[PDB]
């Protein structure tokens, strides 16, 4: 909505309450003071300028008067139009923001530790304080290791273990996720080289040859160009195959649909392995799933420990595995830590599982000694 | 991350290009400028005050300089952490970021040069809501087997040609991620509550008493909407002043509802304690619940026309909408599919098991008067 206002018309006065801000399309405003008639000159606007933002942001009067030098026209932007933009800005935009209003004039804590969380997060990795363990994914019918999950741990000297649940996610939506992203997939490559090597030393021919290392991937360094040649880059530099290498994705990916569709056939026209992590949770879906170069997809552990005790739950679960197996898409049931969940997970057809049934996550020294 | 600096020190000048901003965990500093070697104090910031994010959010030199006025202890906020963070908000807050930026720094005239448009286009949608453009269609959801008109599902139009020019998603996705869906909103929901009376009226006046017992009017409920508190009263006030049952009035919610996890649980079971139906509208795209599906007041599910429009073509989309029906089936929800366009569809849907559907092969969405007329059929 715009609004034309003539030459010398006093749009607001230094003192009134705020009702709303303007964006001048055309013309010239200028912002002043009073003090005892003496009119003491801030600035002079012009277009693409906004003001009366201030009074909004923080219910205050405003803080200046404001004049048409000339005739104008200015689009109105209301309370609720700056109130609702502002509150759903990121918090640390949010903390700027404020400073700056603040000091123009002349959830913070929170803000000031988020920011510090990282900083201590990329400082630990560069201080090699991260290692990958790599958890045991087993046959369910035979109980062999048939391959495992590299999973990212923090061994900080000062704390001791440090939750993943903090970290992972901090990791994963921050441009840091690259540096250390690149950092995983080349340990992980090279931990599946020497794990392959040992299984052939050990006369374990087969095993080798169908041995699949789990990587997790996520969204930002999956959409990254290039990361499909870096990716690349590294399975030759580390002389492996495809076949022996899955990447571990939340279907978040798929909303960027056509695009996602993209790298994912990408990959799989190579012969990489993908996998459909948590699936059934977040946004790692059904409706893609009929369109995805998907081999795997893992039960998340928040329906496993459910399968027992809640039998809606064993519902749900049957239905994915059913579904998994119309689609030639095998199924890896995580969280597993009893038999109980295991006899009826292969009951209703899940070939993998992996959880402290089976093994815990270890380092690559004790991984190796569990496939011997 | 921490450094400790001397008392005395130029932390950095006016004029430096920058590195990187601080917050004070210990100590004091002075902003400064010079001027013909006067200085100019600006302020003293103490513990937990940040400070030389200026030159980092738009790579401008240091506004001002800061010297310690005792030992200080500083924690480091790099280049990279703001610019991200700056360079992915919103465009309005972009504006506003500038301007502020600008002011504190500074006759000449200041200038800037979507936005704006974005602005705009809310200020038209709302006009055009405030000056009677919008009205409510009404889809006839239809039981699979017998062809009987089970209920409808009301669905917003704007009649204006400019509607026209931003899309018929958009103008949707406006209302629904802005303040205006709750008298937007307060308004669909007295609309379709009072043709729901009209309807179960005419439906007993021509002794269908069992039909209008059974029919559903379906209205669409955003997430906003939603999670606003008095949701719930003023749902119940319009109902009591339509003189309805909750029996008789299916809330459709998006799936993304299932964000909040068990504060989404608690809301959804007031609202199916006081009868009402609640239905998932947009099943098996976006967010994926199904772990909270589980333990969900929910008595109907949609399979979107997405689902649909491919079930012949691409038999992996045949198989995921076979396995929502019986799903569904397992945990006594029942399934309306919509989109439904072809007689061969509806063959495939009913073999399947799906009870009810919707779509252009039963009825388009047509004003009251003419659903009136196909209620009679
Ligand atoms: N306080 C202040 N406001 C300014 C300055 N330059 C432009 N303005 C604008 O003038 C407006 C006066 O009313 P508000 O306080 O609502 O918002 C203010 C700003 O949008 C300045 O240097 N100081
Ligand atoms: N320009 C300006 N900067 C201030 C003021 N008060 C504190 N500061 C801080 O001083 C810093 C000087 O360098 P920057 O411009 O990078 O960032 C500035 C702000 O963080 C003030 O009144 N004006
Ligand atoms: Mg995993
Ligand atoms: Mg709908």
Redo the contacts between chains.
């Keep these: 909505?715009?609004v034309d206002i003539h030459k010398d018309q006093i749009i607001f006065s230094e003192g009134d309450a705020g009702d709303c801000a303007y964006?001048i399309?055309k013309g010239?405003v200028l912002i002043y003071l009073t003090k005892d008639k003496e009119e003491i000159?801030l600035?002079?606007?012009?277009?693409?300028?906004?003001f009366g933002?201030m009074a909004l942001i923080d219910n205050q009067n405003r803080s200046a008067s404001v004049r048409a030098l000339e005739d104008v026209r200015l689009?109105?932007?209301?309370k609720?139009?700056?109130l609702?933009?502002?509150s759903?800005?990121?918090k640390?935009?949010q903390?700027?923001?404020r400073?700056?209003?603040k000091?123009?004039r002349?959830g913070?804590?929170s803000a000031?530790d988020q920011?510090?969380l990282?900083?201590?997060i990329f400082?630990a990795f560069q201080n090699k304080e991260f290692e990958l363990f790599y958890q045991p994914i087993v046959n369910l019918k035979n109980k062999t290791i048939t391959g495992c999950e590299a999973l990212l741990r923090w061994n900080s000297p000062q704390h001791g273990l440090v939750s993943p649940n903090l970290f992972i996610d901090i990791i994963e939506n921050?441009?840091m996720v690259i540096p250390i992203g690149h950092w995983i997939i080349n340990q992980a490559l090279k931990d599946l080289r020497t794990i392959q090597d040992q299984l052939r030393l050990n006369k374990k021919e087969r095993m080798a040859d169908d041995f699949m290392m789990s990587i997790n991937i996520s969204g930002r360094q999956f959409t990254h160009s290039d990361f499909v040649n870096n990716l690349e880059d590294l399975r030759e530099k580390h002389d492996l195959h495809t076949q022996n290498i899955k990447l571990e994705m939340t279907?978040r990916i798929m909303m960027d649909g056509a695009i996602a569709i993209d790298a994912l056939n990408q990959c799989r026209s190579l012969g990489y392995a993908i996998s459909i992590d948590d699936?059934?949770?977040?946004?790692?879906?059904?409706?893609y799933?009929?369109?995805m170069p998907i081999s795997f997809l893992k039960i998340?552990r928040?329906?496993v420990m459910?399968i027992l005790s809640?039998p809606?739950?064993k519902?749900?679960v049957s239905?994915?595995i059913?579904?998994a197996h119309?689609?030639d898409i095998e199924v890896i049931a995580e969280g597993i830590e009893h038999h109980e969940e295991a006899l009826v997970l292969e009951t209703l057809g899940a070939r993998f599982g992996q959880g402290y049934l089976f093994s815990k996550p270890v380092d690559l020294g004790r991984f190796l000694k569990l496939i011997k």
């Excluded at 600035?43 to 906004?50: A, D, S, V």
């Excluded at 699936?279 to 409706?287: E, H, I, K």
């Design positions: 909505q715009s964006i399309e010239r000159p600035t002079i606007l012009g277009e693409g300028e906004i933002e689009a109105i932007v209301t609720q139009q700056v609702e933009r502002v759903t800005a990121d640390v935009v903390l700027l923001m400073v700056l209003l000091r123009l002349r913070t804590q000031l920011i510090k990282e900083n201590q400082q921050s441009s279907e699936f059934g949770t977040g946004f790692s879906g059904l409706q799933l009929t369109q998340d928040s329906f459910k809640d809606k739950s519902a749900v239905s994915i059913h579904l119309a689609m």
